[PDB]
C-alpha cells in the first residue's frame, strides 16, 4: 500500500515537473522568435497543470495524502539549440509521463485498487494521442528544417 | 509483443469481415423483398467497417504495426432460406465478434498493456448491447414465423 | 446474360478492392505523420465502398444475382518509401477503377442493355473527374518533392 | 386507533411489495424479449413506489408513525411461462392493492377520520382506473395470443 | 425515319394505356374495401400519363407529329378476384411498358438518334425501380394473404 500512495503523489510532481519543462519550451521559443511553437507549449503548460490538479482533486476525495514535493527547475533548455531539439526533450517527457502512469496503474493492479485503475484509464488513452501527436510535429519539424528557413514557415502559417 | 500485434491486426480484419457478412445478409434481405431487415443489415455493414477503422486508428497512434489482410468472402448467403437462418448466422457473428475482442483483451492483459485494455472497453459494452438486441430480434423473428405471413409485417411495420 | 452479370458482380469487388487500396494508402501516410494526405486517402476509401454498394443495389433492384467475392489484401503498401509512390499507385488504381467501367459499358452495349448503360453514364463522368483530381496531386506533390521538406507543406496546409 | 396506524403502515407495504413485483414482471418480460411489455412494467413499478412514497409523506404530516417493514421477494416469476401468466398475476396484484386500500378507507370511516379518507379519494379513483386497464390489457393477450406469433407482433406495435 | 415516329407515337399510347389500367385497378380495390391499395393504384395512374404527357412534350419539342390513338378499355379487371391477381396484372404492366421503351431505345439506337437516347435514359432507369418496387409489393401481398384476414390489417397500416 506504501508503494501505491508513493507513486500517486510522484504522478502529480511529475505533472507539474511537465507543466514547467512546457513553460521552459514557450520562453525558448519566445526569446526565439518561434511565437507559434511557444502557443502551443504555453497552452500545454497549463494542461499538464490540470492533469496534476486532477490527481490532487482524486486524491483528496480518495484519502490519499498528497505532500507537494518541490517542482524541480527545467534543465533541458540550457542545451537546446534549435526547435528540433525543444521537440525532442518534449517528446521524451511525454514518453516519461507514460511510464509514470503505467507504473502507477502497474501498483494499483496489483493492489486491486479498481478506483484508481478506472480513474486512470482516460490519462492512459490520453498519453497514446499525445505521444502520437508530439512524434508526427517532430517528423515534420526535423523534415522541413532541412531547407533553411522553411521551419519558418510552420510557425507562421500552422501554430 | 508479438502475440499482441497479432490479435490487434486480427481484430481489424475481424471488423471488415463481419462488415461483408452484414453486407450479405442485406443483399439475401433485399432480393427476398424483406427491405426494412435489409436496410438494417446494411446500416449494421456500415458500423462495423467503422468500428474496424478506429481499431486501425488507435494502432496507428500507439505504433502497432497494421497490415491489412484479405477480407474473405461471406459464405452463409448460399444457404439461407428463410430470416430466420439469417438473424441467426447474425448472432453467431457477433458472439464471434465479442470472442475476438476477449482474446484480445486478455492478450493486453497478460502484457499489463493498460492502454490497449482501456481502448477495448467501450467495445466490450458495445458487444453485450449488440449480442442482447440481435437475440432480442431472434427471438421475434421465429415466433412471428410460426404464421404464414406475420413475419412480414415486421418487415413492414418496423 | 452471362458475361454482363459476372461483369457487374465483379465490378463491385473492384469498388471494395480500390477502398481497401485506399485505405492502406492512409495508413502509410498516418504512420508516417502525413496527416493531411491520410485524411484524403481514408475519404476516398469511404467512397469506393459508396460505389460499391451503388452497384449492390442496382443489381439488387434490376435482379442481378451479387455474390460477394473476397477482397483482396493490398500490395502496394509493402514498397511504397515516398508520398509519390503512394499517389502513383492511386493514380493507377483509378485508371483500372476506369477501364473496369468502360469494359462493363462495352459489354451491356453488347447486350443493348439501355438501364445498365444509363445507370453507369455518371460513373464514367465521375472517373474522368477523379483521374484528372489525382494526376494533378500527383504533378504537385512531385514537383514539390524536388526540395527538402517542401512536400511537408503541401501536406500541412492543404490537404 | 391501534388499527387505523397498522393499516396505514401496510398499505406503505403493499405499494413497495406491488412495485417490486412489477419490477420482477419486467425482468421475465425482458429476459423472454417482450421489451415494450417489459418497459410498462418497469413504468408501473416507478409509480407504485411514488404512491408509497405519497403515503410516507401523509403519514409524517399527520403523525402517523411509519416503520418500514420487509418488502417480500417477489415469487410468481418462479412459475411465469408466457405473458398471459405474467398479466394474470399483475391483475391479481392490482385488485390485491384495490383491497388493502379498502381496508385502510374501512378503517379510517369507523375513526371518522375525515382528512385520511379525502386523503385516499384520489387512490380510490385511480384504482378504478388500473385494475380497468390492466384487465382490458389482459383481455387483448388472450386473444392475440390464440394465433402464433400474433402477440410479439403487437408488444413491438403498441407499448 | 417512320419507324422512329411510330413507336414513339405508340409509347405515349402505351403510358396512357397504362394510366387507364392503373384507374381500373384503384376501382377494383375500392370496390372490395382496399383503399390504402386503391390510393396507390390511383397515384400511379396520375403518374403514368405525366409520363405520356412527358412524351408528347418532348415529341413536339423535336417535330415529332404526335397522332393521339383510342386508349383501350382495361380488361383484366373481369377476371380478378383478389388483390394477388391485380398486382400481378400491375407487374405485368410494367413488364410491357419497360419492353416498349426498349423497342423505342432500340429504334432510336439504329438511327443513331442521340437525343432520343438521352430522353429516354431516366425512363430507363425509372422502370427498373418501378418493376422491383411492384415485384416486392406482390411478394408481401402473396406471402400475408396466406392467413385468412393478414393482407386486410397491411392495407389498413401500410399504404
Ligand atoms: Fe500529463
Ligand atoms: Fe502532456
Ligand atoms: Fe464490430
Ligand atoms: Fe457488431
Ligand atoms: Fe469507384
Ligand atoms: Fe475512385
Ligand atoms: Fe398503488
Ligand atoms: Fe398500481
Ligand atoms: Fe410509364
Ligand atoms: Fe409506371
Same mark, same amino acid.
Given at each position: 500500500?506504501? !508503494?501505491?500512495?508513493? $507513486? ?10 511537465? #507543466?514547467?519543462?512546457?513553460? #521552459?519550451? #514557450? =520562453?525558448?521559443?519566445? &526569446? ?13 503548460? *497549463? ?5 496534476? $490538479?486532477?490527481?490532487?482533486?482524486? *486524491? ?8 507537494? &514535493? ?5 534543465? #533541458?533548455?540550457? !542545451? ?9 526533450? =518534449? ?15 502497474? *501498483? ?52
Amino acid at each position: 500500500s506504501e !508503494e501505491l500512495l508513493d $507513486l500517486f503523489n510522484r504522478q502529480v510532481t511529475q505533472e507539474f515537473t511537465a #507543466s514547467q519543462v512546457y513553460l #521552459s519550451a #514557450s =520562453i525558448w521559443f519566445d &526569446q526565439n522568435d518561434w511565437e507559434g511553437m511557444a502557443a502551443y507549449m504555453l497552452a500545454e503548460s *497549463a494542461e499538464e497543470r490540470e492533469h496534476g $490538479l486532477g490527481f490532487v482533486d482524486f *486524491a483528496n476525495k480518495r484519502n490519499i495524502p498528497i505532500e507537494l &514535493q518541490a517542482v524541480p527547475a527545467p534543465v #533541458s533548455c540550457a !542545451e537546446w539549440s534549435s526547435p528540433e531539439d525543444v521537440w525532442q526533450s =518534449i517528446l521524451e517527457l511525454e514518453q516519461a509521463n507514460t511510464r509514470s502512469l503505467l507504473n502507477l496503474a502497474e *501498483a494499483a493492479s496489483t493492489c486491486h485498487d479498481f478506483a484508481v485503475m478506472a480513474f486512470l484509464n482516460p490519462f492512459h488513452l490520453q498519453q497514446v494521442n499525445e505521444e502520437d501527436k508530439i512524434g508526427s510535429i517532430l517528423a515534420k519539424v526535423t523534415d522541413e528544417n532541412r531547407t533553411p528557413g522553411l521551419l519558418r514557415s510552420l510557425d507562421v502559417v500552422s501554430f
